[PDB]
């Protein structure tokens, strides 16, 4: 799985997620990647999310939308919402993985409960950050 | 204005990689976020920025999307993509496609040119071909690294 | 909290001007017979999950409603069926989309939920998974009704002969 | 589309949704019905929801899950949550249709913004209520 989220100079949020699924997966199975609210969600009023990891869990937990709902209705911050989904609710369903989230106020979060997540972020006109391992 | 990207999460071991192997990933990630930071800086849309960044991650054989897609239990490739526009709340998706080089581009097409959010399999392909997208063999996604990972997952 | 079921057979443009009481009563009869089966299962202590599965299988069977038998027609004059089931206890779910050869999609959805590590399968692969587990292959023709066919003709122009 | 939601004597919620789609639809297209959080959701903490209506909109609005999130996180009552989603948010997106919802306390709601919705409900050991038209 691969993913991009962005906030543009106009205040637009957008998200995209693409994958070839899981190594050795049963053909005609569908993980979170092509499912709005599971592996991809964007809303200018809330957040843009791309997800990666156990698809059945990301679907069952509606991970991408749940970030948006925890913030919009729960009054969690992005950081709080990403912690609660990735570190608590995915494992509780037997799930592992991570996501990338940007809210409408430009906050960025790249949580994962896995050994690594190939990841990168950067503000416009500024030096990008890259990561593979934890921290 | 800000972009993040991922190239997937899971069981990566430092013991399993040389620094030179890890640097191909860091180089690939920096080059794609850089492309996106410049697009944003230039006043490109969030939507065209996540579309281009995910099309680049698809092109890069290091990531499990487009070129370098993992293999199914049947040694085939089956690709899935979604795009969502937070401005309109419009969304588009394809699942189970083998003959489209850049699924996120077919996802975009469905978002813009379909009454539906989601199409599947050959119907999704035919929708894309009916609108100028070129047909590819699934063989183009196949890499030595992902094939060896299939045999190891079996073994 | 009292054990309870609700059902629907779809929403949209229903007009009283469109129907006689005797035509409305076919729908009311069908809806009462399905909720009644579900209320009795609940009353007996059957699970919410088994109850919504049986109710949706009954709605699929009933040619009055657009699921299983009495499915609308595609532009291609066949039928393409989709179903989901979710267990509020385990948060497990099963779904099939794009299936033409399974009499009861919500039953195939149950199979995916209960008998796979997956939530969703699509098209021929969904069907093959189901057939590999005792589920019977059917011709799409079984879903076809005069009412839904006539609605297809009403929604289009005919191609030249 | 057809649907069923239930609360059993053990306090378990469940939801199921089945459809043949829209007349004259393009083959290989997918609406809300098979999508967890769009046309089907159940959670013991919140609600069971089956949806029927404009597929494209039910997905974009995550209608089924949004009921659950408004209740779980927003502390809306079922009635409040169903009014908000079906009478406000779907129409704002050009979504016409309705849903059936049962919460963990045995409240039932069968909202629709359409002319009709073929519907029925009833408590165990009690006489069903049936409906086609508005009210
Ligand atoms: Cl690192
Ligand atoms: Cl009525
Ligand atoms: Na790639
Ligand atoms: Na039926």
Author numbering:
A (entry chain DDD), D (entry chain BBB): 179 to 313
B (entry chain CCC): 4 to 158
C (entry chain AAA): 2 to 162
Question: What do the authors report?
Answer:
l-Asparaginases hydrolyze l-asparagine to l-aspartic acid and ammonia. The prototypic class 2 enzyme is EcAIII from E. coli. EcAIII belongs to the Ntn-hydrolases, which are expressed as immature polypeptides that dimerize and then autocatalytically cleave themselves into α (∼20 kDa) and β (∼15 kDa) subunits to form the mature (αβ)2 heterotetramer (a dimer of two αβ heterodimers). The same Thr179 acts as the nucleophile in the autoproteolytic maturation and in l-asparagine hydrolysis.
Mutant RDM1-37 has a serine instead of Asp at position 210. Its Oγ atom is hydrogen-bonded via two water molecules to the side chain of Ser211, which was not replaced in this variant. Of particular interest is the case of RDM1-43, which has the same D210S substitution as mutant RDM1-37, and yet in contrast to the latter variant lost its ability to autocleave. In both RDM1-43 and RDM1-37 Ser at position 211 was preserved. Mutants RDM1-37 and RDM1-43 differ in the type of substitutions at positions 206 and 207 (206→S/V and 207→T/G, respectively). It is possible that these two differences changed the mobility (conformational disorder) of the linker and significantly lowered the probability of proper conformation and orientation at the scissile bond. Asp210 and Ser211 could be substituted individually (variant RDM1-37, D210S mutation only) or simultaneously (variants RDM1-3, RDM1-8, RDM1-12, RDM1-18, RDM1-24, RDM1-29 and RDM1-38) without any loss of autocatalytic activity.
